[PDB]
Write a protein that binds this ligand. Structure first.
Ligand code: CL
Ligand code: CL
Length: 162
């Protein structure tokens, strides 16, 4: 298992524009296009990102390409973020993938916000962090996904994805 396979299970893959869990326009493997409620605003963003008139549909390749860009961006954002980096640096490889999954889903800013959980993680207080992470809108809205990620932080194994 690795980050790519992990996110691929969490996000799925769709080749046509779709509404995500929050009702926003997305495509491929969890690639947000736009938060605007306009399908045309979506299509526009889509063509701009692929560099062709897609008309709302992309290939498997195109999707994987956006995915690769998106994972790269998450990692680099973590590395760039004063609050996140130190947490990342402190973790093991499995747990680093769980942090990346969160940043991919919610954004760097959204995650940097989990102050208390972040601190618990840096301290390696696993069971505490897990409890704290569960008290969040994130867990209430996407509970199955959140449980997978939390179990991952809890254990340092990939069992939730097995
Ligand atoms: Cl892009
Ligand atoms: Cl879920």
């Amino acid at each position: 298992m690795n980050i790519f396979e992990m996110l691929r299970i969490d996000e799925g893959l769709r080749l046509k524009i779709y509404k995500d869990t929050e009702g926003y326009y997305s495509i491929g493997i969890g690639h947000l296009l736009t938060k605007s409620p306009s399908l045309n605003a979506a299509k526009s963003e889509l063509d701009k990102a692929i560099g062709r008139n897609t008309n709302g549909v992309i290939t498997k390749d195109e999707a994987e390409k956006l995915f690769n860009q998106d994972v790269d961006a998450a990692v680099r954002g973590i590395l760039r973020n004063a609050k996140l980096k130190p947490v990342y640096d402190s973790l093991d490889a499995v747990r680093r993938a769980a942090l990346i999954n969160m940043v991919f889903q919610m954004g760097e800013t959204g995650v940097a916000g989990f102050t208390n959980s972040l601190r618990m993680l840096q301290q390696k207080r696993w069971d505490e962090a897990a409890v704290n992470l569960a008290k969040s809108r994130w867990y209430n809205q996407t509970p199955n996904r959140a449980k997978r990620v939390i179990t991952t932080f809890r254990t340092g194994t990939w069992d939730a994805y097995k």
